[PDB]
Each structure stands twice: as C-alpha cells, then as structure tokens.
Design a protein around this ligand. Structure first.
Ligand SMILES: OC[C@H]1O[C@@H](O[C@H]2[C@H](O)[C@@H](O)[C@H](O)O[C@@H]2CO)[C@H](O)[C@@H](O)[C@H]1O
Ligand SMILES: [Cl-]
Length: 138
C-alpha cells in the first residue's frame, strides 16, 4: 500500500531512543533492498541487503559523504528471503544504529555522521512490497 521508493521524513533528525520500523515483503527473485538515512545529499547510514553478489547473500552497510562511498561494513548473517514478509527495526542509540530483523538482533553501525539532528530523511528502496514505514520514541 506504499509506493517504492518511499521517502519517510524524520522531523528534526534522529535522536537516541528513536525507533524506525519498516514492514514489507521481499519480492520473488529479489536482487536488493536499501534503507538510506540521509543528511541532505549525504547518506549517514546505508543498509543494503544484496541477494546475489557473486552468488552470495550479504548485507552491505556504508556512509556516503560528498558523493563518495566510504569503507563498507559487511554482515554475512542474512535474515531476508525472497517472497517473505519482514520487519526491520532500526533503533538509534548514542553511538550506533542498532538493527533487528524479525525481532532478532542483526547488526550495529557506529555513527560516522555525527550531526544526528540533521539526518532528516529515510529513503526505502529495492525489490519489496512496502507495507508500513513509521517511527516512535521508546
Ligand atoms: O558501499 C556501498 C555502495 O556500494 C556500491 O557498489 C560498490 C561495491 O559494493 C564494491 O564491491 C565495488 O568495489 O565498488 C562499488 C562502487 O563503489 C553501490 O553501487 C552503491 O549503491 C552502494 O551500495
Ligand atoms: Cl557530521
């Protein structure tokens, strides 16, 4: 019921205790999913499940500054499956984003962009049917 790519504004940026929840279903024969927490043109946190990178499934995380991608942090634990519904929860903590998928902790990503209050948009894209994109304070 939501258009993809989807832009979710994050008013006044992010802050510790902010929980962002994305519900969707992976399409059959999916290639990629991307969450992009943006600070203007910069990407503070790119969370990028890849379903077929040299016949491997991997999650690539990174930051884009001044149009340049930085050093990739790769996670081989891969909780997504083509055709299946998922929940991604991103909890903002003082020193990292903490990601859980389907209620199971997946990874953390240390804050490289430090102006948390300027990370004011989340872009959601890729091979999914998007059901819900929302946030709350815990
Ligand atoms: O780093 C995130 C970024 O990756 C780009 O692709 C990389 C690829 O991961 C790497 O193996 C290769 O050496 O360089 C490519 C270009 O930097 C994606 O194009 C981009 O969308 C992000 O996902
Ligand atoms: Cl910064």
């Amino acid at each position: 019921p939501l258009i993809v790519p989807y832009n979710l504004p994050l008013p006044g940026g992010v802050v510790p205790r902010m929980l962002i929840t994305i519900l969707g279903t992976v399409k059959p024969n999916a290639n990629r999913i991307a969450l992009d927490f943006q600070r203007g043109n910069d990407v503070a946190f790119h969370f990028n499940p890849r379903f077929n990178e040299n016949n491997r499934r991997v999650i690539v995380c990174n930051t884009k500054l001044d149009n340049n991608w930085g050093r990739e942090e790769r996670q081989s634990v891969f909780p997504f499956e083509s055709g299946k519904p998922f929940k991604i929860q991103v909890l903002v903590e003082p020193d990292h984003f903490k990601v859980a998928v389907n209620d199971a902790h997946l990874l953390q990503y240390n804050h490289r962009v430090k102006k948390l209050n300027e990370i004011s948009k989340l872009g959601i894209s890729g091979d999914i049917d998007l059901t819900s994109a929302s946030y709350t304070m815990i």
